Amino acid sequence: AQYEDGKQYTTLEKPVAGAPQVLEFFSFFCPHCYQFEEVLHISDNVKKKLPEGVKMTKYHVNFMGGDLGKDLTQAWAVAMALGVEDKVTVPLFEGVQKTQTIRSASDIRDVFINAGIKGEEYDAAWNSFVVKSLVAQQEKAAADVQLRGVPAMFVNGKYQLNPQGMDTSNMDVFVQQYADTVKYLSEK
Structure with missing residues (x-):
């Protein structure tokens, strides 16, 4: 398939009941988190791509x-x-x-x-x-x-984004892949 468990995302072997729909973790000490937030604007491109009725949560x-x-x-x-x-x-x-x-x-x-x-x-x-x-x-x-580890993102306490399985040569294209993947996962 185009989206494969173990490829752009992983499935939690023990699911978290009652978790927030889209849940992002970061640290202000975390260099990739700085990149994610200050340069790539991941959080912002994802909410812009979430379906109606799915709220976003971000925790330190x-x-x-x-x-x-x-x-x-x-x-x-x-x-x-x-x-x-x-x-x-x-x-x-x-x-x-x-x-x-x-x-x-x-x-x-x-x-x-x-x-x-x-x-x-x-x-x-x-x-x-x-x-x-x-x-x-x-x-x-x-x-x-x-x-x-951070940065990290989880969808419905069941799936974890896996950005290592993505082309980072273009920053724009990586962000939209990441966002499109969250959208896909949220419609699962």
């Missing part, structure tokens, strides 16, 4: 960057709670990987402040139980698929 992971890595999972929970993902994703990637100006939780906080979130509102969210359960959700989703 702990297993890179030690203590700062965990802080970033909590900050991403704050990003989700406040609905400001599209305001902090770029300065967080660039702060960690480009300028390397993010070294502490306070430096992460500065990014939100500069993005216009009030300090009092950030701090309230950071310490909130709604954010704690959002952190838990991120951890549980990663645990459900025994996640060990």
Whole structure:
């Protein structure tokens, strides 16, 4: 076939009941994640190719960057709670990987402040139980698929994208293949 299990995707041998429809994992420490998000715009080209009625979910992971890595999972929970993902994703990637100006939780906080979130509102969210359960959700989703590498994407808790099985000579063509594959998998 044109799409083959084991070729553009793999099937989870033990399926995750109740998983989000399209589930992407990343780390702000992750070089390919920077590429995926800042250069290739994978997340954006996929939602643009999802059928109607299928929502997209993106979670941060702990297993890179030690203590700062965990802080970033909590900050991403704050990003989700406040609905400001599209305001902090770029300065967080660039702060960690480009300028390397993010070294502490306070430096992460500065990014939100500069993005216009009030300090009092950030701090309230950071310490909130709604954010704690959002952190838990991120951890549980990663645990459900025994996640060990990023970037990663899962469709319906059953299939895992396999981008190594794709031509990267043209960046545009790779992104649309990736997106078209997610669409295919979501209609499975």
